[PDB]
RNA sequence: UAAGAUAUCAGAGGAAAGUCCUCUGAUCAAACAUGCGCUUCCAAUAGUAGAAGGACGUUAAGCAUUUAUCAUUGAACUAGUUCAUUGAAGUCAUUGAUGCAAACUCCUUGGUCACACACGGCGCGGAAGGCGUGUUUGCUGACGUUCCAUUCCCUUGUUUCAAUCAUUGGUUAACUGAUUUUUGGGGCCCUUUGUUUCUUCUGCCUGGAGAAGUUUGACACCAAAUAUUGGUGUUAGGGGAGCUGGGGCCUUUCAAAAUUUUGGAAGGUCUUGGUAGGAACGGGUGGAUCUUAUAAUUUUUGAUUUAU
């Protein structure tokens, strides 16, 4: 007999094709997509709880650290730490999905932009994406002069929220 | 075929077939020469054999020669009891 | 046991390496469970492209104990 | 990666990041074309068959195959089994014990309880016609009831109706055992 | 018949497996598999020296001897000791079994007798 | 170094960092995770180690030091045909007692899933 | 056998090869069959003397594969769970 | 891909030959216990160390070497060499590759335990084997069906001293030992890094706290499309009572043999393990192994000792 252990279910009618109908079935794909999403975070979320080995401290260092004053520690509340871990987890999700693609935005009206950045129609990748519009025929006859009320200004540089109040308050020149 | 049918077939091919040379060499206590694909030959007496041509031997005398720039030497190594894997052999003769 | 699925390859020009050094290009007709393969208009490729290259025959069949790789030089 | 021709969506496909390309290392074994087992295998020579005599004089008597004598013990014992059977087949028109009236009148009854008697045998078999004789057979070597008997009916149609009835009927229960019936056979 | 079923009864014996390479392996034998996968214990795997005025020995096997991690640095001759070596069957060329054991007790296969005794 | 169990077959020594030899004289050293009828095996974080042709004169019979050129390749599936022998290197990160503990908690947790699945399939 | 069942788990991910001739292919793996033979798509092929090229589609007799390197996140796919609890099968 | 099988041997018994089945021996194996003056290993604090393994790290363009296409046509040329043109293929590299060696830096691992600073063992552990007895079992695991099953308490910085309080025992109100409550003093740890990392909720470094809960359940987390459904994981550690298994020892009772040895029953003492599932039975049940199809190109019955 045969079964798929992501779904945990046995196949009802065993043939080769019923397997392939289950192997590329919508239900089964959503399981195996979700199964590896759980094993991804679990290696990171279950952080290596290391084992400590405490040495018997010296007579010398015990006197040199006694004269040194005891520093204050900061412990947050349970309600506080449940929110701050909700934030810091959601922040690391953002740094995954940045993908800084300003450079594609800069060469928009150039003479080979269809052939290099559209990426349905390169050579290296182009045959593979057609399986799984802005065509390759585009030349520099259409849109001769870019600035004819068409172009958008460059989106300004991003900044950190936490340190949003380090910015100089006034601009040097008067913008419109 | 059945399991009993193959037992008849195996007794035939050992007795009335090409491997009858080995089987008639085991029973009659006649020494054989064997050539392995090692390019060295062993002069021995058979005590058992099998389907795969592997065989347990007794009073083995191997005779292996080597050469390095047309300088030859003939080495002789004696062994009491040996068990030979069957793929290694290419030709078994039965001595007169 | 199972037949190798080269169903998408057939009737395209195909280079393949026989044992070690010899490379044989032709148009793939048929195949079997052992990967012994048969192809039309064969040509043995070498280092000099027109010079050492010579044609083999109208139909030739290769044993699958000498296929290493089999690249499909077409779509 | 960019394209990801896979069943999964773009996040999950980017999750299986492969380790970077394998570093190249210049190979140490032999090239696949040049690979071969040792050729030039010098055959079993005449000079080799001349040097056999140094081996032959040293070990002139081979060791005895005593593991073969375990097979020659058993196969010869099976032939001696046939000869004791051959001593029996020469010895039924003789036995005295099977040598009353017509053999077409004789029922064999078999598997009868060791602990039957001829009177219970007679009761059951007299169900299918008048009896001319009985005999339970007992081991002549010591009188263990053998579990068979021979029953001679006044007519062979009553012998074959007794056969019908009380053997193909699963075996006639007499005392506590299931008793085949046949015709005489012998 | 399988003569590999003879090797299974040869268990806890000193033995020399001698490989296709030319590497001999002197050790204490354990369970031999049906495909002849012999598995040894207190072993000492070596290469002989084909003398003949410095004829070069097996180039691949010398690499595979050092790689095992058993070759000690001050091994002057080419040997390597270690515990436990599992050996894939097809590589066995010979097996030099010891002088003491009697073949006649061991070469009587049980399935050979159990076919004749049953018939 | 490490003393392996005197009768321990390839099925027993899962998680033991092995030292597998191929026919070409190249060695793959890693944690074993599966095996098979014809003895092809899955190592976890293996490293192929090769003696280069230049170093090989140094191993010919006369402390020797050998420049072993190695390359990382994590999670392989070897082939059987190629393996020549195996040897044991390290022992697993978890104890012998602790590998029984993780079995019984996982054996308990696996059974809990089925009964929670069967009763979620039965009524709905 | 798990060694082979793993290779099916790696469809549509980048893998490597090493053919016994001493080549090294590394491209996305499209098909595999039970004899460990594979079809790779969009590959980079490294000849035994170092020469590298690119080929769109390649097939390899499984008999000549020396090893396959798989993505490292399948090290904890459920082939490797020792104690597994399958449910009772449906009746045929 | 299929079929078959689930240790072998020997004896007695049931339905002259063999098969089937059952209890009695031997051997073999697994699991579990449990021993051996068994073997090996387990890191400074009386100090700023060190052992094993790495670095796909640096010094470093180190030092020492050797390498950068072939064919066709003309000119000059010695009697090979340079220049220009035409064709063929062409991993990248020359700060390379190959050999030699050092220094430094940094990473992962552990009993950084207890007692002692004392002229070739028999401290308490943990890790890894070898060897020996005993019990169970004879491939192993879910699942169903009838049955046997059937507990608690304290603690989650730790240790030590002092103060008092309570409880229990010894002896002639007093003394002593054990245990518990409130405070104070001293020692060590707090990386527990989400400040105890068994959950949830409250909460903290001038403190180690408080509330609720513990498996047909609860909690955490991930995924969506417009609350729901589908997935992964957590549910712990320490001590004591009970209850029960195994081990050694002691005394008593009994049977055999010639005061002793061997076996069985009970009580006492030391030590060690378990403490919520277990038995029978049942299936067109799962997986393991074994034999044969299978020595005929895709693994194991030889094309890698470079060999004439």
Numbering used by the authors:
A (entry chain B): 3 to 134, 153 to 196
B (entry chain M): 13 to 108
C (entry chain Q): 2 to 76
D (entry chain A): 1 to 91, 94 to 188
E (entry chain L): 1 to 119
F (entry chain K): 3 to 64, 72 to 133
G (entry chain N): 5 to 96
Task: Show the paper's wording.
Specifically, while purified human U1 snRNP (~250 kD) contains only ten proteins (seven Sm proteins, U1-70K, U1A, U1C), purified yeast U1 snRNP (~800 kD) contains seven additional stably associated proteins (Luc7, Nam8, Prp39, Prp40, Prp42, Snu56, and Snu71).
Most secondary structural elements are well defined and a large percentage of amino-acid side chains and RNA bases are identifiable. We built atomic models for almost all essential domains of U1 snRNA (excluding the 5ʹ-end 10 nt of 5ʹ-ss recognition sequence and ~230 nt non-essential region) and partial or complete models for 15 of the 17 proteins. The U1 core (Sm ring, U1-70K, U1C, U1A, and U1 snRNA) is located in the “ball-and-toes” region while all modeled auxiliary U1 snRNP proteins are located in the “arch-and-heel” region. Although the yeast SL2 and SL3 regions are almost three and 15 times the size of their human counterparts, SL2 forms a 90° bend in the middle and SL3 is largely peripheral, enabling the U1 core proteins to bind at similar spatial positions as their human counterparts. Prp42 (544 residues) is a central component of yeast U1 snRNP that interacts with all visible auxiliary proteins, and connects them to the U1 core in the “ball-and-toes” region. The C-terminal TPR domains of Prp42 and Prp39 interact extensively, both using the face made of helix A, to form a heterodimer-like structure (left).
